[PDB]
Amino acid sequence: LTPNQVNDELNKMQAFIRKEAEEKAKEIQLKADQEYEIEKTNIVRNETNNID
Amino acid sequence: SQKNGIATLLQAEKEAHEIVSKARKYRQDKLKQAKTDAAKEIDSYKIQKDKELKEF
Amino acid sequence: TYANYNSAKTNLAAAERKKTGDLSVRSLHDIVKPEDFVLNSEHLTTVLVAVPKSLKSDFEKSYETLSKNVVPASASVIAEDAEYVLFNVHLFKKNVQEFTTAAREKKFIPREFNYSEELIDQLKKEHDSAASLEQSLRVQLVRLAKT
Secondary structure (H helix, E strand, O other): OOHHHHHHHOOOHHHHHHHHHHHHHHHHHHHHHHHHHHHHHHHHHHHHHOOO | OOOHHHHHHHHHHHHHHHHHHHHHHHHHHHHHHHHHHHHHHHHHHHHHHHHHHHOO | HHHHOOOOHHHHHHHHHHHOOOOOOOOOOOOOOOOOOOOOOOOOOOOOOOOOOOOOOHHHHEEEEEEEEHOOOOOOOOOOOOOOEEEOOOHHHHHHHHHHHHHHHHOOOOOOOOOOOHHHHHHHHHHHHHHHHHHHHHHHHHHHHOO
């Protein structure tokens, strides 16, 4: 159509992509932190069992 | 053309990728530090048990 | 030898049958598609062209239209042809479903080509390779058959 709808085409797609990327990065960081905590607990349990 | 929009989107994606890599590295460093702390705690527990054995 | 020459000639004819853009056959060998600003996107690669039923340079303008949200792509392009309307549109795989929807919601069916530099160069040189195969088949088989 016409380029007169710049308000939803010039930057709306960019904002949506940036929001999706930021959400994915935040979710990945949170999941990595949770997995790191779980693995740390497991390693602590294993090391404590070996030392015991 | 929307060269400004293209450049903004590309820079935003690059910054997001860099932030994701930094967050992954920070999580890995936290896991490594927690593993080191767990090993130190296990060694301290073993040392306390050895001190208890020496006291015995 | 005659069969090889005929096969090389058929290959050259098939290579030349590809219309240079503005139609279902692209001009990636000698067009501005791989070198356009659509080459790489933020998280995808932009590739789109059409044979518009309205006017030439329509796919360049259509990206500037509301379709720019139908795929996170935006880029300048120099694609035109008077006889058959030629242009290039912008569409990114980050909205691959929506990008395909934007490519299909028009008078032209989806039409895109490989913008990778190595693939573009290989495709461009494939025609030269077919022509060289025909020329070498001629040079060899003609002398061999004269003998």
